Amino acid sequence: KEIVFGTTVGDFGDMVKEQIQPELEKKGYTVKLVEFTDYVRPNLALAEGELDINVFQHKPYLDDFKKEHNLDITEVFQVPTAPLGLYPGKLKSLEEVKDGSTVSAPNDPSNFARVLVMLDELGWIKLKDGINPLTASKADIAENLKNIKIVELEAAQLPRSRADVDFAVVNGNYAISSGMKLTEALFQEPSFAYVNWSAVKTADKDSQWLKDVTEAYNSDAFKAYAHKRFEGYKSPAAW
């Protein structure tokens, strides 16, 4: 049987080619990897049948997408994921924030809510008490303490936005594929609510090939591989 993987370019794809694939091949499987530069196509490909499984999103994003597009897909297991971070732009230190400082952020809702929670934690803005952090939006901002100018861009553009803003909050997968380092972050998301999950069509939830893939992503071998290969990554809660 052939298992078709769909991932964002970079780290999630490397995991498959460097480790997962060879492991599954010694069980008889043939693997095919399809990489995506964007966040929109993977779930569509999975639902359509092009992919048997994709690895590139967190639950809040999956949940938002499934609902908006009515797709029968579901999360299965978590994987080591690059954390969301606030990186230096024109400014080099959190201490340099000015009234009116610009901060770039991804524009899709589930990821944008994260930026607002982070700005709240840093004390640059204050979110209204009791609001759902997973869906935090601008309407939820009680006070913009530092009159921060939030610049919204398509997720894939965040890395090179650093040249035009004071600080940029970059999704990990794009930070890594754009030559950035996790240690360059001035502040990282402390939460574990966004550790990425693999997703499949609800119909395959109990398949034998999926069972083989999930233990491939949880063996002592994979954990050792991940520990040295993706240092600084957030680990699956299950570990």
Whichever of 127 and 156 has its CB closer to ligand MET, that residue is 156
Residues that bind ligand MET (CB under 6 A): 39, 56-58, 61, 81, 84, 111, 171-173, 194, 196
Q: Min. distance of Cβ 61 from ligand MET in angstroms? A: 4
d(CA 203, CA 189): 34
Sequence-separated (6 or more) residues with CB below 8 Å from residue 210: 52, 53, 76, 200, 204
Q: What minimum distance in Å lies between the beta carbon of 236 and ligand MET?
A: 13
Least Å distance, CB 3 to ligand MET, is 21
Instruction: Tell the smallest beta-carbon distance from residue 63 to ligand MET (Å).
Output: 11
Give the span between the Cα atoms of 150 and 74, in whole angstroms.
32
**Looking at beta carbons only, is 81 or 198 nearer to ligand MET?**
81
Q: Are 54 and 12 in contact (CB under 8 A)?
A: no
Which of 38/96 has CB closer to ligand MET?
38
Report, in Å, the least distance between residue 99 CB and ligand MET.
29
CB 16 within 8 A of CB 38: no
Of 58 and 201, which has the nearer Cβ to ligand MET?
Answer: 58
Cβ proximity to ligand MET, 57 vs 104, nearer residue: 57
